[PDB]
Amino acid sequence: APEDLLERLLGEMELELIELRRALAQTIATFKS
Amino acid sequence: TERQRDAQQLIAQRWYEKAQAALDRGNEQLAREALGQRQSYQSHTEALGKSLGEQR
Amino acid sequence: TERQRDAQQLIAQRWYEKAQAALDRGNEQLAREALGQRQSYQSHTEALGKSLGEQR
Amino acid sequence: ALVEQVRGQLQKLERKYLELKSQKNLYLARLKSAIAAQKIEEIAGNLDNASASSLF
Amino acid sequence: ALVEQVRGQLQKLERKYLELKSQKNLYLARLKSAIAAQKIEEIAGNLDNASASSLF
Amino acid sequence: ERIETKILELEAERELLNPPPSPLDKKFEQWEEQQAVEATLAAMKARRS
Exposure letters E2-38 (e unless 16+ CB within 10 A, then b): eeeeeeeeeeeeeeeeeeeeeeeeeeeeeeeebeeee
D54 touches chain A (CB under 8 A): no
User: For residues E41 and E43, what is the distance between their CA atoms, to the nearest angstrom?
Assistant: 5
The verdict on a CB contact (< 8 Å) between A33 and F5 is: yes
* Chain C residues closer than 8 Å to F32 by CB: 18
Rg of chain F over CA atoms, in angstroms?
A: 19
Q: Which residues of chain F from 7 to 46 reach within 8 Å of chain E, CB to CB?
A: 7, 10-11, 14, 17-18
DSSP string, E13-50: HHHHHHHHHHHHHHHHHHHHHHHHHHHHHHHHS-SSSS
**Full 3-state SS string of chain D:** CHHHHHHHHHHHHHHHHHHHHHHHHHHHHHHHHHHHHHHHHHHHCCCCCCCCCCCC
Query: Residue B39: which of F36, F48, F49 has the nearest Cβ?
Result: F36
Chains that touch C (3 or more CB pairs under 8 A): F
The minimum CA-CA distance between F2 and chain A, rounded to whole Å, is: 11
Using alpha carbons, select from C38, F40, E50 the residue that is nearest to residue B46: F40
Chains that touch A (3 or more CB pairs under 8 A): D, F
